[PDB]
Design a protein around this ligand. Structure first.
Ligand code: CLA
Ligand code: CLA
Ligand code: CLA
Ligand code: CLA
Ligand code: CLA
Ligand code: CLA
Ligand code: CLA
Ligand SMILES: CCCCCC(=O)OC\C(C=C=C1C(C)(C)C[C@H](OC(C)=O)C[C@@]1(C)O)=C/C=C/C(C)=C/C=C/C=C(C)/C=C/C=C(\C)C(=O)C[C@@]12O[C@]1(C)C[C@@H](O)CC2(C)C
Ligand SMILES: CC(=O)O[C@H]1CC(C)(C)C(=C=C/C(C)=C/C=C/C(C)=C/C=C/C=C(C)/C=C/C=C(\C)C(=O)C[C@@]23O[C@]2(C)C[C@@H](O)CC3(C)C)[C@](C)(O)C1
Ligand SMILES: CC1=C(C#C/C(C)=C/C=C/C(C)=C/C=C/C=C(C)/C=C/C=C(C)/C=C/[C@@]23O[C@]2(C)C[C@@H](O)CC3(C)C)C(C)(C)C[C@H](O)C1
Lengths: 155, 63, 50, 92, 188, 171
């Protein structure tokens, strides 16, 4: 799991809602949200850099990542990403939502889906780091969406 | 069936077919229709009771 | 007659709801005072407990 | 010319008097049926129909105002209808 | 027969008052004010609760699909248009009219084939003789739900609730295109 | 429990009687129709696509039939279909395919469901019959090439129409 960090707790849980919907689905959703946010903040800053995907045209035109999800939708590039993420996430929907509020969540309630291809490190520090940067990038991408809707550039 | 029982009449040509009546007297002898059943509704002649056989009564309520 | 009729409709509807629910099956003369504990006029409306 | 079609703009014709009469006729029928049940359950059913028990008759008569609900409750409870093997029938 | 108490589908928000509660279902009997599920006792013409559950499951599923189609067709997101066929009618309830017979005649045909071929045992319902069928159990997503009892019943209750809301909504988007104003915030 | 998806159970009815069964049925489509019909459909589709890939990459690089004349079919395999529909040769091909499909498909699909034979034999062994290990190896190779050339023909046609075929046999 993951407690505070230098004290030992169940983290800040003032609402105490961990006894309402099961902790396995909570941890799985936390990891998925965080990994989505980590890819989101990196993709945001990389588009703001000026880096381009191998598919050319309309990608440098709709820069700053805010006209990205208004012109790539009508350019048809956004639909392919939607359906690819949809097929992988419906495989995940099978393997995850087959078990909820009941039958066991014995897949490691986080990143247990495959992934043992290149590193095979399996560090506990890696797990702690993964969840910590997951939530750090949650707040980072929240900031990058909200601050840059009125400011621009590096802020 | 016994005296005071509530019976349902199964004779098809009777005026009280599928109707409830009360057993008055069961005669013990050679009578072909020994059971006497009295009804609360008169027929067209106005006769309240009739003599019935044991297989023409279906029984509803014990005494 | 001067006031809007929807006001009367809603008032009569609220009274209808109140007296439909205040005696759920105890309408008519033969069904209301079947329980020998319902004294007449006692609908249980005594919140202040006089 | 009255339009008994069922259009909403001609509901001042047939349809609204239709609902009114259906309510009133069901009221009359339910009052008669309730008094019939009471007179059947007494000791002299015949004398209760030529000489009416006026207080009880007024009770059923005023209590038949909720006939569509009471009739539905009796239909669901199985007291409205005789099974069919208990009503007399001609030999055929 | 199955006397309506073991059927999942009771709702907590009809026991919202002090007294009665649970996960999402009311404890003392599901909601049936007109006692329509007890109408099989008098005459066999009235359907059993199994047929009623199959009917509302079909209505709810079609209504989820219909309200999702209404929400998506009404503003953009139309299929790419080729020769002799344009999916351009953004106004719902008139989109099948501006459509060739090879397209509107193909939706109805396949719907009818799937409806007829999944109709094995609906008339073993109407009488409580479940055995097979088991109301809405077409097989599309059986063994996909959880294998315990509480989670499966929770999933089914989720299906029934969303479905009922969709029914009420697709009938709020309808009856408003017919007569102006049956839904105050309409958007369609 | 599966082999192509080693995180989410194993599909039902995919026990391994058919060759090349790695348990790749995430949608659970092995329940709508019998598995003999599905295997027959997969094998027929694969044979059609392998012949289609061979014919496309042979016609496109340049080869004409006996007396195939000079029309827009001879320009490329792109317009060959629209050329041969107008010349009526596609009606003759449809007649031959319909005759063989009547005999083969009706017999082959009628008798698996009755119960009588392996799903897709046709008994035209043409040589190798005695070495049953090579028979099952050839079944595995046949279905693997079937899937590969279904993908290959899909890719070929989509690549050629995405640029309207500017005379590219690598495409
Ligand atoms: C999916 C398979 C398929 C399809 C649809 C086509 C379709 C076509 N080919 Mg083609 N071809 C194929 C495979 C295929 N080919 C293969 C595998 C080769 C070998 C390399 C060729 C070699 C080839 C050449 C060399 C030429 C064509 C041409 C043509 C075009 C006109 C053909 C014609 O007049 O036939 C209709 C006339 C007929 C007499 C019908 C053919 C009947 C045969 C025998 C097939 C019948 C079924 C057959 C026995 C298979 C059943 C197997 C079963 C026993 C298991 C047309 C677009 C010609 C063209 O115009 O292109 C420019 C041309 O010149 N093709
Ligand atoms: C939104 C995604 C998300 C999810 C599903 C979780 C889920 C979880 N976290 Mg977590 N967390 C998150 C975001 C999330 N967190 C963020 C952004 C941070 C940084 C502040 C943390 C920091 C954190 C710590 C330090 C700890 C947890 C712990 C936990 C676990 C128990 C606590 C719980 O259920 O409350 C989380 C419930 C929710 C997030 C529900 C959402 C409630 C509202 C909608 C969010 C507030 C709105 C707005 C943003 C403010 C559970 C697995 C504890 C743990 O691992 O226990 C062993 C623990 O020690 N989390
Ligand atoms: C992320 C989790 C994960 C893991 C650990 C594996 C692991 C494996 N897959 Mg696999 N696969 C995955 C996701 C995964 N797959 C997904 C998401 C799909 C759908 C696109 C597939 C589709 C798939 C097929 C079609 C096949 C495999 C096969 C295999 C096995 C041989 C290695 C190989 O060629 O990889 C392949 C990796 C990706 C295609 C191996 C056990 C093969 C097998 O079963 O060999 C016995 C095989 O034929 N996989
Ligand atoms: C950068 C922070 C970070 C860290 C430390 C980890 C750490 C881990 N991840 Mg992970 N992950 C992350 C971000 C991260 N993740 C993101 C953003 C995604 C979304 C694409 C994923 C998706 C993911 C999957 C799908 C899986 C893991 C798995 C793992 C574990 C073993 C693999 C490994 O060594 O990864 C090392 C990772 C890095 C060195 C990051 C690369 C840095 C780039 C190049 C910059 C380990 C606990 C596997 C696991 O837990 O299996 C049980 C597994 O299956 N992760
Ligand atoms: C309140 C008593 C009552 C009720 C509920 C019914 C109910 C019915 N009668 Mg009916 N009937 C009644 C009295 C009643 N009848 C009387 C008194 C007569 C003799 C005149 C008839 C003669 C009669 C015939 C000839 C026929 C029916 C038929 C029917 C059925 C169809 C409806 C209809 O045609 O109504 C029409 C009703 C009438 C024409 C008679 C109405 C006479 C008065 C207004 C009703 C009696 C009210 C009573 C005096 C109230 C006193 C109670 C009070 C003390 C509380 C229906 C089951 C028909 C049938 O079988 O259809 C299936 C049919 O053909 N009835
Ligand atoms: C196709 C319509 C339909 C059908 C057949 C059913 C069937 C059922 N519902 Mg259900 N329901 C529906 C729609 C429907 N529902 C909708 C839209 C809602 C949301 C308001 C609900 C909310 C609901 C709850 C909260 C509960 C049920 C329950 C039940 C079961 C027992 C009650 C019963 O006998 O109802 C029989 C119903 C019918 C025969 C439908 C016909 C309706 C009448 C007769 C005609 C139309 C009148 C209506 C007012 C139309 C006017 C306009 C309308 C659109 C508003 C039964 C399986 C209970 C349950 O789950 O038991 C296990 C339960 O607790 N339902
Ligand atoms: C969100 C609404 C919702 C929910 C919760 C369910 C839930 C369920 N459906 Mg269901 N269904 C729905 C909408 C829904 N359905 C619609 C709209 C249709 C019409 C296409 C169907 C058609 C359908 C059939 C034909 C069958 C089911 C079955 C089932 C049950 C098996 C588990 C399963 O496959 O679902 C898992 C569902 C989810 C994980 C939620 C859906 C996730 C999102 C909304 C997908 C969006 C894209 C389960 C109770 C089967 C059954 O009753 O067997 C017992 C069955 O045979 N459903
Ligand atoms: C995903 C489809 C739906 C989306 C469409 C799509 O993808 O786009 C099309 C596209 C380009 C594009 C687009 C533009 C035209 C540029 C612009 C469009 O903008 C609009 C809308 O206008 C958007 C976009 C992205 O569409 C690119 C698509 C590329 C795609 C789809 C590539 C699939 C390869 C598959 C392979 C190689 C499989 C090999 C499988 C093989 C080789 C096997 O069988 C291996 C095998 O082991 C198996 C598995 C089982 C074994 O027993 C047998 C063996 C061993 C043999
Ligand atoms: C204008 C336009 O655009 O379209 C054009 C397109 C295109 C393609 C150019 C055209 C063409 C040509 C076409 C369609 C040609 C089709 C030709 C066709 C289909 C010709 C069948 C022959 C049957 C035979 C040989 C049977 C032999 C039977 C034999 C050899 C037997 O031994 C039978 C047998 O019974 C015995 C005797 C004894 C039995 O014990 C045993 C068996 C059963 C084995 C057209 C017409 O111009 C139209
Ligand atoms: C059974 C029998 C016989 C037989 C037989 C037969 C017909 C055997 C036939 C086997 C056959 C014909 C097997 C084809 C495979 C095709 C493949 C693998 C295609 C790969 C294509 C691939 C992998 C890729 C293609 C690409 O297009 C892509 C994807 C994009 C392009 O940019 C690049 C290229 C073009 C490269 C006998 C023995 C002859 C007689 C006996 O009596 C009966």
């Amino acid at each position: 799991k993951l407690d505070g960090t230098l004290v030992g707790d169940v983290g800040f849980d003032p609402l105490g809602l961990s006894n309402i919907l099961p902790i396995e689905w909570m941890r799985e959703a936390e990891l998925k949200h965080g990994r989505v946010c980590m890819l989101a903040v990196v993709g945001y800053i990389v588009v703001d850099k000026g880096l381009r995907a191998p598919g050319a045209e309309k990608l440098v035109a709709a820069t700053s990542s805010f006209t990205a999800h208004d012109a790539a939708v009508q350019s048809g590039h956004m639909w392919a990403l939607l359906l690819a993420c949809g097929l992988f996430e419906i495989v995940g929907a099978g393997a995850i939502a087959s078990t909820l509020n009941g039958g066991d969540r014995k897949p490691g309630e986080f990143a247990l889906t495959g992934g043992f291809d290149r590193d095979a490190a399996k560090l506990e520090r890696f797990k702690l780091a993964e969840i910590k940067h997951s939530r750090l990038a949650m707040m980072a991408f929240s900031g990058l969406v909200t601050q840059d809707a009125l400011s621009h550039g590096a802020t | 069936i016994e005296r005071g029982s509530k019976v349902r009449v199964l004779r098809p040509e009777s005026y009280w077919f599928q109707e409830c009546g009360s057993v008055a007297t069961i005669a013990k002898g050679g009578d072909r229709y020994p059971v006497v059943v009295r009804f609360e509704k008169v027929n067209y002649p106005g006769v309240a009771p009739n003599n019935f056989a044991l297989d023409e009564l279906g029984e509803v309520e014990a005494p | 007659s001067s006031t809007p009729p929807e006001a009367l409709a809603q008032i009569v509807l609220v009274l209808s709801i109140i007296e439909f629910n205040s005696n759920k099956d105890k309408w008519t003369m033969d069904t209301m005072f079947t329980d020998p504990a319902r004294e007449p006029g006692n609908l249980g409306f005594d919140p202040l407990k006089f | 010319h009255l339009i008994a079609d069922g259009r909403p703009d001609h509901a001042g014709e047939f349809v609204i008097p239709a609902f009114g009469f259906l309510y009133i006729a069901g009221w009359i029928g339910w009052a008669g049926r309730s008094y019939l049940q009471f007179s059947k359950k007494t000791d002299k059913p015949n004398e209760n129909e030529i000489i009416i028990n006026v207080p009880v008759a007024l009770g059923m008569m005023s209590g038949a105002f909720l006939w569509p609900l009471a009739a539905w409750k009796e239909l669901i409870n199985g007291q409205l209808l005789v099974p069919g093997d208990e009503v007399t029938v001609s030999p055929r | 027969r199955k006397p309506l108490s073991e059927y999942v589908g009771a709702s907590q928000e009809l026991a919202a008052f002090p007294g009665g509660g649970g996960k999402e279902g009311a404890a003392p009997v599901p909601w049936d004010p007109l006692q329509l599920s007890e109408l099989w006792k008098v005459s066999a013409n009235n359907p059993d609760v199994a047929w009623l559950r199959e009917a509302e499951l079909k209505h709810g599923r079609m209504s989820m699909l219909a309200i999702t189609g209404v929400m998506v067709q009404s503003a953009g997101i139309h299929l790419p248009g080729n020769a002799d066929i344009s999916f351009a009618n953004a106004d719902w309830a008139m989109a099948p009219t501006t459509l060739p017979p090879a397209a509107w005649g193909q939706v109805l045909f396949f719907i009818g084939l799937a409806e007829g071929q999944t109709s094995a045992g609906l008339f073993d319902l109407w009488l409580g003789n479940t055995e097979k069928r088991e109301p809405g159990n077409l097989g599309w997503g059986t063994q996909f739900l959880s294998k315990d009892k509480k989670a499966a019943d929770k999933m089914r209750l989720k299906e029934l609730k969303n479905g009922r809301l969709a029914m009420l909504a697709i009938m709020g988007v309808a009856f408003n295109h017919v007569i102006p104003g049956a839904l105050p915030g309409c958007m369609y």
